[PDB]
Amino acid sequence: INNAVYTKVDGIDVEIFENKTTLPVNVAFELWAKRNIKPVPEIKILNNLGVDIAANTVIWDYKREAPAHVSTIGVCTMTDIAKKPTESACSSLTVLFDGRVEGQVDLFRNARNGVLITEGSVKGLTPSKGPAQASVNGVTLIGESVKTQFNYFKKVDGIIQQLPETYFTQSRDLEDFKPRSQMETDFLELAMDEFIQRYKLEGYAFEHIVYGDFSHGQLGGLHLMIGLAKRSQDSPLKLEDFIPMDSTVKNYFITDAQTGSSKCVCSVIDLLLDDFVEIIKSQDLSVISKVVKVTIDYAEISFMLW
Amino acid sequence: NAVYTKVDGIDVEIFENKTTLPVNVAFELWAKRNIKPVPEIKILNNLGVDIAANTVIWDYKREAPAHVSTIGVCTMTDIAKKPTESACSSLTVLFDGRVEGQVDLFRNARNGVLITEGSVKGLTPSKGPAQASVNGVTLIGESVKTQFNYFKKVDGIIQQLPETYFTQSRDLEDFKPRSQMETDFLELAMDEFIQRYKLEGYAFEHIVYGGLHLMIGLAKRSQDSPLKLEDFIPMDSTVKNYFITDAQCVCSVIDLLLDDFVEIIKSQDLSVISKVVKVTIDYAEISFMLW
Amino acid sequence: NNAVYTKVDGIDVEIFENKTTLPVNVAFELWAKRNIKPVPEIKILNNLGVDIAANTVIWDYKREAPAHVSTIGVCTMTDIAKKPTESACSSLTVLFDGRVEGQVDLFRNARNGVLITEGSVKGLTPSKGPAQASVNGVTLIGESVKTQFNYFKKVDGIIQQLPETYFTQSRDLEDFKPRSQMETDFLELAMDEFIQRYKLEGYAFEHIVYGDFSHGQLGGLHLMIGLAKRSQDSPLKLEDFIPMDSTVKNYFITDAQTGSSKCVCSVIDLLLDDFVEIIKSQDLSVISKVVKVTIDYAEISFMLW
Amino acid sequence: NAVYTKVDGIDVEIFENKTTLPVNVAFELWAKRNIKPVPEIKILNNLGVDIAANTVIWDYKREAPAHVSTIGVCTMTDIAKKPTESACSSLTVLFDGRVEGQVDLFRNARNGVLITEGSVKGLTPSKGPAQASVNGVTLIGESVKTQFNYFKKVDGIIQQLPETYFTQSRDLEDFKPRSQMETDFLELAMDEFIQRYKLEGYAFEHIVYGDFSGGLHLMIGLAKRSQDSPLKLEDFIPMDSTVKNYFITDSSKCVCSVIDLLLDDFVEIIKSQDLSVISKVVKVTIDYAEISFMLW
């Protein structure tokens, strides 16, 4: 009645892995058991970049409990569409290339479509710093020991790309919300007015927004995490992924922590407050439209700021 | 600069304010205000439009000008004498066609929207909404042309505009059906309506009768314990919040034709489980939970 | 069903599941009244003797049940009292939370208990506890709100002195931050650069940190940071063997990459500086190689070299 | 100080390095080494015994003194002349009741442990193992008394003294059974033992019969395994412990924790844990220490 895989640790079956894909069990297990468990970029970034297949490894989506991509390359014979990631079979596919391993750079130099991540500089090519944080075997974190911050490069049809200037979502939760800057600390520490005062924000309608819904169309309000975090000395909130998939704007079930009383299904975006202030101040208030399109996580998000 | 009074010695400049502008130039905007029938602000907002060309668009709901930077309207607020030229082509300019010159300036400017009441050589139109704002009065013209054809450019490129539903713009106070369906819905009880339009075993239930609310459903509930809405925060939003009380919620309401909303309701699976729906309404992508 | 729900939108969302002897409605209430502010972890509480909470409910999120058998003035159907000073309590170590008013007071009157406070208390000397607390069952150290308490104990009338203790950090291996300069360079140096930098030759450090210093406990008994370094290249999935929290914790150890077995066995997570202090403390010229250490207020016995 | 030689002398002192002591004084230790039959080091270690009074306990596997800290033995190494002084305040000191005077010094001592060949005024004995260590050879005394009665003091307070199993202290080569049960376990096939000593549907299976994969094993279990297809093992490190590691070869099996329990004792352990067949965390007392381990 099962598709679970086990190991014996003493006279005890512990379930090492459950199969939640359509693939036959042991085929899936192979796939898993070849996950890159070193630092990878996060699913949101790779979706946003339009990446469909990784070179020579497997990116596992730990929330979805399945591999992040349809096929493979030089990994698992029963789903490999190729062996070297330059075979005719995948010229028309944005291929993740991990520059930390040898010879992947030139594989990418010779690829038609792809993105290359690396720990450092690359000869003749302009980087763009990515997030501070990466994904170490499920857990996303910013790390002291291992380096988690990469530089991205993109190719669309023979040609290197200019990657948009972006902000990055901070991949934080409410359970453990840690301030990442002075402004952020202050905001949580101080009282609204004393804050607006200190950072010079009179007549921006700050209080209105941080706490308010700035959705241009996303499902339920668009609230900002650090803003949800401040409304938590009073009765605080539990979150819960509405859909397993990771993305920049994220749908949740918000319910009271203390008692479960339902609230909404609404979207949160976790941004550095500094980056948030910068965008509220970017808005020109003299024009008709109050939609602000900002590019965050290499993707375009539309806001309603007023 | 500002006009002033001399209230015994001396100059006491007089400011609007509501826009902070000198009454002086504030009023010069009211003057040059567009008086021919214009697109409702919500659709301008959605299409992300910045300034109109050689005019002001008035915000009668805010009782202020929709925009305080101008093109060829008032020297104290003009960012440029003419739309198609220099530090100006980055922002999205609304070009109106039923004034001549303008049409030709759209094909020369970078970012911009264009409305017209007929077709234009070589371009594909997208039918706008029936209604338009007429000096603060939103209405469906039969004496005058209020329905436009829209066209948009970004970075130089003509865009294909999405297939859309448009919101109806009805106030509740004087609500009035616009189809056999909307009629029947208000007449028929719940159960009979679900069986006439073969809707049984779909989602809609809560959203229609009683998160997000449908204006038309809110009107049927008005014949039951008459309710009133007042917007704490008055702009013009495709989805608007209202303070809701009786004749003795803070609600998202959307005004949609049932004939359109039931097209939506049916383009799902036979549920009855709650569904995420992503429609284009008023040129903008709306996500909401249907049940 | 055991399951309690709210309709979020039109969707059944489980907010609570019963895994208790009690009926749903009663357990749910207890859950629903559980203190969700910062609290001492259960290891510290059991180590101390606490068997009941004043006016609150300590919840075990790993065991998904109350931390304690009865209540005081929380829930009419599991209350043994209403006030913590009633004679039905005078034989039980009661947790008194100083951060709320007058609880300090009931603690003076109480004949058996433990009082935590976020600052000094007139007449009594404090035991500066761990840096970390549990906050709605996510154990963390807070810079935002406070997580570090002071402890006091009473045993049948009499004020107590708490032994001086080391405290287990509380760090899963899946996310392991070093908390001192010693831990940083340990992880980021070679063993031999290390032993020298900190002048540790003539202790058989490499033998200890990396090995098994157990006197009895089931499986090996390994330092966490120890495991984290060997983890560096060949990493390990670590998984609770028993829901109950404790100072020395048994685990199912398993390869991360593939699930190959390894063992059941205990880990203890200590600050390296503390560990190094404990090895340096052992007197090498005696028959017994058993070092007893008080950690998290309990006696923990080791085996050294 | 150290003795020395003269090579183009210049005095050249002489050391070890087993202890680091002057050969000189390391030998005084050898000289004063207790040669009456003393309890096995493991039991001393577990009772947390620090040093012995007016004697030296020798560790033959380490080929050295179990302790370098002395009392009343040697000027260079001791910490007190007499076990009662305030230097032995905080140290568990072994006292013997075979040398008189000491039997009484235990009464006016803080922390310490005492052994005797018979009972003592109004103290409850805990009957120790059958075996002592008689000069590097441990055995069960035929004509000499090797069983002890133990008593312990922590902080002037006479202590609890638990009930214990004891390990049998048997090397594998020279292996001899010590009951009908151990006898049959060697004789009877894998399946026959189970029906005879009615223990079908208990845990016990693996740890008694043998693996590739590695947890605890018991001595006799390994003996039956080499009772054909012989197996060789030896101290990886030369300690003395209730549970010791071995290199099994065999060509290797390889690093096992091994425990030498008399079967009947271990069997009464299996039987104290309701019919299951599921793995079982046992927490038992062996050699006066709480050892916990997984039974399957």
CB D126 within 8 A of CB D149: yes
Whole-number CA gyration radius for chain C:
22
CB C92 within 8 A of CB C49: no
Cα separation, C256 vs A6, in Å, equals 13
For chain A, the distance separating the N- and C-terminal CA atoms, rounded to the nearest angstrom, is 55
C21, C23, C25, C28 alpha-carbon torsion, rounded to 10°: 10
Nearest to B184 by CA among B173, B175, B197: B197
Q: How many residues does chain C have?
A: 305
Please state which architecture CATH assigns to domain B36-161. 3-Layer(aba) Sandwich (3.40)
Q: How far is CA A59 from the centre of its chain?
A: 13
Cα separation, C105 vs B50, in Å, equals 65
Cα separation, C210 vs C226, in Å, equals 5
CB D144 within 8 A of CB D37: yes
Cα separation, A40 vs A34, in Å, equals 13
Resolution as reported, in Å: 2.9
Q: Which two tokens stand for residue D146?
A: 């090797």
Burial bucket for residue C97 (CB in 10 Å: 0-12, 13-18, 19+): buried
Rounded to a whole number of angstroms, the distance from the CA of D140 to the nearest CA of chain C is: 23
Backbone angle region of A136, left / alpha / beta, with phi > 0 → left and psi within -120 to 50 → alpha: beta
Suggest the residue from C7, C18, C144 to mutate for an interface test with chain A (most A CBs closer than 10 A): C144
Rounded to a whole number of angstroms, the distance from the CA of A10 to the nearest CA of chain D is: 7
For the beta carbon of residue C32, count every other beta carbon within 10 angstroms: 17
CB C140 within 8 A of CB C117: no
For the beta carbon of residue D39, count every other beta carbon within 10 angstroms: 24
D278 CB within 8 Å of a chain A CB:
yes
What are the boundaries of each domain within chain B?
A: 1-35, 36-161, 162-291
Q: Which two tokens stand for residue A165?
A: 């200037």
Cα separation, C169 vs C247, in Å, equals 10
D68 and C285 within 8 Å at the Cβ level: the answer is yes
Q: Does domain C37-162 have CATH number 3.40.190.80?
A: no
- The yes-or-no answer on residue D206 being catalytic is yes
CB B229 within 8 A of CB B140: no
b/e burial code for range A120-155 (CB count within 10 A of at least 16 → b) = eeeeeeeebebbebbbbbeebbebeeeebebbbbbb
Cα separation, D110 vs B35, in Å, equals 105
Please tell me which of the candidates D213, D281, D289 has its beta carbon nearest to residue C215: D289
**A11 vs D contacts (CB less than 8 Å):** 203, 205-206, 278-279, 294, 296
Q: What single DSSP character describes residue D235?
A: B
Strands lying side by side in the sheet with A139-141 = A39-40, A134-136, A139-141
Q: Which of D206, D224, D244, D271 is catalytic?
A: D206
The CATH number of A38-163 is which of 3.40.50.2300, 3.40.50.11580, 3.40.50.720, 3.40.190.80? 3.40.50.11580
C286 and D50 within 8 Å at the Cβ level: the answer is yes
Q: Within a 13 Å sphere around the CA of D234, how many CA atoms are in the beta-carbon half?
A: 3
**Which residues lie below 8 Å from residue D277, measured CB to CB, with a gap of 6+?**
D201, D202, D203
Q: Which residue of C has its CA nearest to D286?
A: C216
Cα separation, A156 vs A115, in Å, equals 9
CB D87 within 8 A of CB D50: no
Whole-number CA gyration radius for chain A:
22
Give the amino acid at B79: I
Q: Which two tokens stand for residue D63?
A: 């080929």
Residue C265 — φ and ψ, nearest 5°? 170, 155
Suggest the residue from A8, A10, A13, A14 to mutate for an interface test with chain D (most D CBs closer than 10 A): A10
Rounded to a whole number of angstroms, the distance from the CA of A155 to the nearest CA of chain C is: 31
Beta pairing, strands C133-135 & A222-224: unpaired
Cα separation, A119 vs A147, in Å, equals 7
Cα separation, A6 vs A14, in Å, equals 6
Suggest the residue from C6, C7, C8, C9 to mutate for an interface test with chain B (most B CBs closer than 10 A): C9
- Those of residues 7-36 in B touching chain A at CB distance below 8 A are none
Rounded to a whole number of angstroms, the distance from the CA of A126 to the nearest CA of chain B is: 24
Please tell me which of the candidates B48, B49, B285 has its beta carbon nearest to residue A217: B285
Cα separation, D139 vs D146, in Å, equals 8
C285 CB within 8 Å of a chain D CB:
yes
**C-alpha torsion sign, points A125, A128, A132, A133:** negative
A218 CB within 8 Å of a chain B CB:
yes
- The yes-or-no answer on residue C222 being catalytic is yes
Residue A108 — φ and ψ, nearest 5°? -75, -35
Experimental determination technique: X-ray
Cis peptide before B10 (omega within 30 of 0): yes
- Those of residues 102-141 in C touching chain A at CB distance below 8 A are 135-136, 138, 140
Q: Which two tokens stand for residue C182?
A: 């010693």
Q: Which of C37, C146, C237, C262 is catalytic?
A: C262
* Angle subtended at Cα A295 by Cα A289 and Cα A300, rounded to the nearest 5 degrees: 75
CB A269 within 8 A of CB A301: yes
Helix (H) or strand (E) holding C53: strand C52-53
Q: How far is CA C129 from the centre of its chain?
A: 11
Give the amino acid at D263: L
Q: Which two tokens stand for residue B231?
A: 């917007």
**Which residues lie below 8 Å from residue C27, measured CB to CB, with a gap of 6+?**
C16, C18, C20, C65, C66
| The three-state (H, E, C) secondary structure of chain A, written as one string | CCCEEEEECCCCEEEEEECCCCCCHHHHHHHHCCECCCEECCHHHHHHCCCCEECCCECEECCCCEECCCCECCCCCCCECCCCCCCHHHCCCCEEEECCCCCHHHHHHCCCCEEEEECCCCCCCCCCECCCCEEECCEEECCCCCCCCCEEEEECCCCECCCCCCECCCCCCCCCCCCCCHHHHHHHHCCHHHHHHHCCCCCCCHHHHHHCCCECCCCCCEEEHHHHHHCCCCCCEECCECCCCCCCCEEEEEEECCCCCEEEEEEEECCCHHHHHHHHCCCCCCCCCCEEEEEECCEEEEEECC
Q: What is the largest CA-CA distance in chain B?
A: 78
Helix (H) or strand (E) holding D89: none
b/e burial code for range A15-35 (CB count within 10 A of at least 16 → b) = ebbebeeebeeeebbbbbbbb
As beta bridge partners, residue C249 has C267
